[PDB]
Copies of this chain bind each other. A is one copy, B any other.
Amino acid sequence: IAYVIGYVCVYNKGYQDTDTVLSSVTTKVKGIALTNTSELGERIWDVADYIIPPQEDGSFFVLTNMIITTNQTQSKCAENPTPASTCTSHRDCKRGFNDARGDGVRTGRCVSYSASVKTCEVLSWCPLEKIVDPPNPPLLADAENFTVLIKNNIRYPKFNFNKRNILPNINSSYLTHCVFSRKTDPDCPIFRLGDIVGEAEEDFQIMAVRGGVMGVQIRWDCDLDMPQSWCVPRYTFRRLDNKDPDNNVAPGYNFRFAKYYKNSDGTETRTLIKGYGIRFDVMVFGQAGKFNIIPTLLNIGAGLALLGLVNVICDW
């Protein structure tokens, strides 16, 4: 049955010799955002404000919601209310003990956080970060309308193949005022953050309150036997974190950083920013194949050997 083995080699790509992809990614974010709060007045956020890591290859972080604590100085200080931190006598707090909250290290004497309750005195940057819910709606909801240009460049080493996701039919005039869309502009690398989140069956406005990790995946599945015109990337978007709050720890995505200031007196103070944002991971993978005689001959020989079993079984 030469037809059977021929069809098997045709559809299983057994005659193919395959190789992996070596990729480079560069993303640039463009947009502006306006915030209007009592504390910050009226404010605008340029490209240098809402991208906390200014440029890291492979991913980017877009700040969406955020909490500030200003004028923090190292001092002995009160503690946030907590059942493990309540004071009934000066002997309750253990000198030098380190707690799981991580606000600071305890001391012997303890002071009153307020008139009603007293908590252990700790060494820390005070005033401490107030334990409050993040603002809703998010400050940077305008980050729904940002754009991101993703430039990709792959190489297949063994076959000596180089390619970029910007197809050569496209020109700069079209790319200046272009926006990606599956129905209209499938070849445009300039995505919209709102579209990226929406195509993963999510809502950006709800996501931005606590953040989340979103992955953008690009598939480079190119058949090098056919000309390079059919070597085209395919874009997919997925949500990487977990919605369910009963299984994971610290739902959402956020992190803390600081800005250090030196006063006129020489004392060092710091402003602590806790930022929640959407982190976009760019993942590139693929596998490309070419023609080779030796695998074809090996597969043909093995198929003809299996034809012996086919005949033996047909005999019975």
Among A14, A44, A164, residue most surrounded by chain B Cβ atoms (within 10 Å): A44
Q: Are A22 and B285 in contact (CB under 8 A)?
A: yes
The answer for the CA separation of A314 and B124 in the assembled complex, in Å, is 83
Task: Name A219-275 residues within 8 Å CB distance of B.
Answer: 219, 238, 240-242, 245-250, 253, 255-262, 264, 270, 272
A261 & B259 in contact (Cβ 8 Å cutoff): no
Work out how many copies of this chain go into the complex. Answer: 3
Q: Write the chain B residue with the least CB distance to A52.
A: B54
- What residues on B are CB-neighbors of A61 within 8 Å? 55
Least Cβ distance of A310 to chain B in Å? 9
Count residues on chain A whose CB falls below 8 Å from chain B CBs: 96
Interface residue A104 (Cβ < 8 Å from any Cβ of B): yes
Q: A residues near B, CB below 8 A?
A: 8, 12, 14, 20, 22, 24, 26, 28, 30-32, 34, 42-44, 46-49, 52-57, 59, 61, 74, 98, 100, 102-105, 123-125, 145, 149, 151, 153, 155, 157, 164, 166, 168, 170-172, 175-177, 213, 215, 217, 219, 238, 240-242, 245-250, 253, 255-262, 264, 270, 272, 279, 281, 283, 285, 294, 297-309
- Would A255 and B32 count as touching, CB distance under 8 A? no
Could you tell me if B52 and A53 are in contact, using CB atoms closer than 8 angstroms?
A: no
Residues in B with CB closer than 8 Å to A240 are: 24, 153
Contacting pair B308 A304 (CB below 8 A):
yes
Cβ contacts under 8 Å, A307 to chain B:
301
